[PDB]
Scaffold this active site. Structure first.
Site, PDB file in Angstrom:
ATOM      1  N   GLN B  17      15.197  48.196  18.156  1.00  0.00           N
ATOM      2  CA  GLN B  17      14.355  48.529  19.368  1.00  0.00           C
ATOM      3  C   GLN B  17      14.589  47.784  20.652  1.00  0.00           C
ATOM      4  OE1 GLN B  17       9.538  48.910  20.743  1.00  0.00           O
ATOM      5  NE2 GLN B  17      10.217  48.413  18.583  1.00  0.00           N
ATOM      6  N   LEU B  72      32.487  54.991  14.502  1.00  0.00           N
ATOM      7  CA  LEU B  72      34.109  54.229  14.554  1.00  0.00           C
ATOM      8  C   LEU B  72      33.830  53.078  13.566  1.00  0.00           C
ATOM      9  CD1 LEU B  72      36.304  53.846  16.143  1.00  0.00           C
ATOM     10  CD2 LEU B  72      35.074  52.592  17.988  1.00  0.00           C
ATOM     11  N   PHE B  97      23.120  42.265  18.062  1.00  0.00           N
ATOM     12  CA  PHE B  97      23.411  42.004  16.640  1.00  0.00           C
ATOM     13  C   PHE B  97      22.475  40.490  16.456  1.00  0.00           C
ATOM     14  CE2 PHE B  97      26.126  44.968  15.464  1.00  0.00           C
ATOM     15  CZ  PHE B  97      27.322  45.061  16.542  1.00  0.00           C
ATOM     16  N   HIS B  98      22.239  40.467  15.042  1.00  0.00           N
ATOM     17  CA  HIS B  98      21.615  39.408  14.433  1.00  0.00           C
ATOM     18  C   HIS B  98      22.564  38.204  14.724  1.00  0.00           C
ATOM     19  CE1 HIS B  98      17.786  40.660  13.019  1.00  0.00           C
ATOM     20  NE2 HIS B  98      18.568  41.629  12.130  1.00  0.00           N
ATOM     21  N   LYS B 130      17.318  34.571  12.567  1.00  0.00           N
ATOM     22  CA  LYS B 130      16.955  35.987  12.822  1.00  0.00           C
ATOM     23  C   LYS B 130      15.413  36.215  13.249  1.00  0.00           C
ATOM     24  CE  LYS B 130      20.250  37.867   9.319  1.00  0.00           C
ATOM     25  N   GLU B 133      10.502  41.391  15.971  1.00  0.00           N
ATOM     26  CA  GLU B 133       9.382  41.348  16.875  1.00  0.00           C
ATOM     27  C   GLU B 133       8.389  40.360  16.801  1.00  0.00           C
ATOM     28  OE1 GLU B 133       6.917  42.175  19.591  1.00  0.00           O
ATOM     29  OE2 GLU B 133       8.370  43.679  19.304  1.00  0.00           O
ATOM     30  N   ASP B 162      10.416  43.165  21.281  1.00  0.00           N
ATOM     31  CA  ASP B 162      11.462  44.077  21.064  1.00  0.00           C
ATOM     32  C   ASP B 162      11.581  44.812  22.301  1.00  0.00           C
ATOM     33  OD1 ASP B 162      12.401  43.678  18.564  1.00  0.00           O
ATOM     34  OD2 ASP B 162      11.219  45.118  17.669  1.00  0.00           O
ATOM     35  N   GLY B 241      -7.754  35.893  33.472  1.00  0.00           N
ATOM     36  CA  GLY B 241      -7.298  35.739  35.112  1.00  0.00           C
ATOM     37  C   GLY B 241      -8.532  35.037  35.634  1.00  0.00           C
ATOM     38  N   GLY B 242      -8.803  35.547  37.194  1.00  0.00           N
ATOM     39  CA  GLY B 242      -9.827  35.143  37.896  1.00  0.00           C
ATOM     40  C   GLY B 242     -11.080  36.103  37.655  1.00  0.00           C
TER      41      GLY B 242
END
Ligand code: MET
Ligand code: MET
Ligand code: MET
Ligand code: MET
Lengths: 410, 410
Positions: B17, B72, B97-98, B130, B133, B162, B241-242
């Site tokens: 992702q 490929l 990649f990992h 590794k 998410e 992700d 927040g405020g």
């Protein structure tokens, strides 16, 4: 020796968090960002959540590093004149107001890119509704799908409606700069807080369609002994994707709210996981050997892992488990993050010296570049650069003095 | 007639992702995105969470619209040759990649920008761990600060580790393209999942510093009758927040998990809020007239508003309350979002025709541009464009046939 946005001039009307996060990044990429502020008041974050009396709040300093500040009253003859001169010179104008026309601006400066953040899209039934952070989280799908199945919708600490919306507007502005290299023209770029939230919830729209088709979601906690309704339910601490996981208690959880890890049961790592937790029998047991087989009793499995994790410190737990290539990490508290040496070394957490305050920490520029390094600097004092900017625009010292006097008298 | 990234060529090794979300946007901005996939297998999302046997999953189609796919094998003499020719022609190479060197690539193509997503920064103690998410959500501060004070750390449904990481890499790639207009050179851009999460949690680092200084956070539910520890605590459905707010029950909440609204008590809107809920006496009562005065009994106030909201449908509640300029919205479910006509009209939710599947919904391009409109198309079948790409690289039909045959035999 060069930066990505060297020579780019930004007129920045933004306040609070969505717009300022966007223009702070523009400044870090080398643009000249001029904050145009209400005289005597400035961005509301200057005064919200102060920790030191009468000086700019951390809410402001962590979102406005590297910017310039002018005070400008557009409601006077001289203010309108200053505004027109600024627009003629600028590359980008950014605003994020709650609900000089674009037509006029295009005529003044056909190269100008105009960026706008709103709560909702122009055709939304909610177009005129004010949105703060969590209003967008509710309207965008995130609150519905975050939390537990037997608890309320839950807002995320992450600024899904604010900084996230800023990052999406930033994408649009950089794309518009690239497009201008081809067309020689600026354009309008708009971004809504609701759409920013939805974009991060894309995978929950995947799940809604799966649920519509099948009537169940195999990897959700509700399968197979619970119930599914018409909409994607809250799944507590479930993986959210193709690899199950959960938040597991570590030693000290009774008193320490961050004594936990996240643990992923990675499909391709099942045998190593079994070795880690002393369950070699689960390598070939048909009830455990595949993800499909594990799912109906997945919480019994998490319970078995937790019998180990509850006995050691979270950092020890991760040190042990990662030897077996398990994807896992401690739940780091904001205190741990604020002090982590690796985050200082990476420039992810950055110490900055602020006038009148001294040192503060900010989150730095998140992505790293081999060909340039941002230099993160102090936030502007209110109106610190008014005179400098007017000088750059060609106003004389007597004219500047007259403008300041006229204002003081009005 | 033109797009921002017209003529840009991307070599895309990404899967799952984070990376695919980034390169899907590149495609929508006009780049030619070639997914380089493992022969006979392809991106794991093609086969994860399928709803229809033997065809690409929605996980894949919602992240790979508008891309081309080649198969490929780099481990052969001809695969390495194809790879070198692709690198010579490309503008951008992306991988996630990992845990063909960069040195070599620079020599082949000094204009190439190399984008990389990892779980953690190069100097992190977790560099080789590794991350999925929720591993990033734990390591980045979000799980610690999301949820309730008396419950566990909670993951957010929003893809903070992700798609969010993808959007941040995208920012870097567009900045690098802009920088290349100045230097004539490419560069390496890196982004970590932990840093993406932290950037969205900037305001929780604000709060950690306030807590360090003062020992309490005035706007958090724990003030003044609870307790603060050393780290920012979970605040349930607090504003963040405020401007305070909360998730309030509406009619049907006992059976409908999304029968709720988010309601903000906006400081500058207090009198209008009082008029809305039939409490004019609270306009001047010193216990209610200011935010500071309201805070110690803020939940009594939310309880009073909920006495009204629980009696009507959430959409009715928002229709009534917004007349008084209250920032509020329903908690929209994924079902409501999937069917909302305004989100179709805005291009936020987009219907796409996919070969072999038929219609699916995706989240569209979130920001809107006045000078171009993306055309969102189907996802590629595995290897759909292998022959076309080899032809564009100058391979003859006999050479392509020979490559396919060699592969079939091996
Ligand atoms: C209301 C939200 C505003 N339109 C932005 O920021
Ligand atoms: C369901 S919350 C955690 C409980 C334990 N991990 C079992 O399963
Ligand atoms: C592990 C996460 C990987 N490095 C990305 O995606
Ligand atoms: C504390 S959860 C909601 C309870 C109710 N809104 C009061 O306050």
């Amino acid at each position: 020796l060069s930066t990505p946005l060297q020579g780019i001039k930004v007129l920045d009307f933004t306040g609070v968090q969505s717009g300022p996060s966007c223009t702070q990044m523009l400044a870090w990429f080398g643009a000249d960002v001029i904050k145009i502020e209400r005289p005597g008041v400035g961005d509301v974050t200057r005064h919200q959540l102060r920790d030191i009396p009468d000086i700019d709040a951390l809410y402001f300093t962590m979102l406005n590093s590297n910017k310039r500040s002018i005070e400008l009253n557009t409601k006077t003859a001289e203010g309108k004149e200053v505004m027109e001169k600024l627009i003629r010179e600028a590359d980008i104008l950014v605003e994020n107001f709650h609900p000089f026309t674009w037509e006029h601006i295009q005529e003044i400066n056909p190269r100008l890119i105009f960026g706008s953040i709103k709560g909702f899209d122009e055709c939304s039934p909610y177009v005129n509704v004010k949105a703060y952070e969590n209003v967008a989280q509710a309207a965008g799908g995130a609150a519905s799908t975050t939390g537990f199945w037997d608890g309320p919708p839950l807002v995320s600490a992450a600024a899904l409606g604010d900084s996230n919306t800023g990052m999406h507007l930033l994408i649009g502005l950089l794309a518009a700069l690239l497009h201008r290299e081809k067309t020689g023209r600026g354009q309008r770029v708009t971004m809504s807080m609701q759409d920013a939230v939805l974009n991060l919830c894309r995978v929950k729209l995947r799940d809604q369609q799966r649920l519509d088709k099948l009537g169940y979601l195999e990897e959700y906690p509700q399968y197979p002994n619970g119930t599914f309704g018409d909409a994607v339910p809250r799944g507590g601490n479930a993986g959210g994707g193709g690899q199950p996981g959960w938040i597991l208690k570590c030693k000290g959880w009774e008193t320490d709210p961050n004594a936990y890890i996240y643990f992923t049961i990675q499909e391709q790592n099942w045998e190593n996981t079994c070795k880690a937790i002393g369950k070699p029998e689960w390598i070939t047991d048909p009830a455990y050997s595949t993800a499909h087989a594990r799912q109906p009793h997945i919480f019994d499995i998490f319970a078995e892992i937790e019998k180990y994790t509850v006995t050691i410190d979270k950092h020890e737990a991760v040190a042990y488990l990662t030897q077996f290539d398990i994807p896992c990490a401690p739940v780091l508290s904001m205190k741990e993050i604020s002090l982590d040496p690796s985050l200082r070394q990476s420039g992810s957490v950055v110490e900055v010296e602020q006038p009148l305050r001294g040192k503060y920490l900010t989150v730095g520029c998140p992505m790293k570049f081999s060909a340039f390094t941002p230099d993160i600097k102090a936030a502007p004092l209110l109106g610190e650069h008014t005179a400098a900017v007017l000088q750059e625009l060609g106003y004389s010292d007597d004219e500047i003095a007259a403008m300041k006097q006229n204002h003081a008298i009005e």
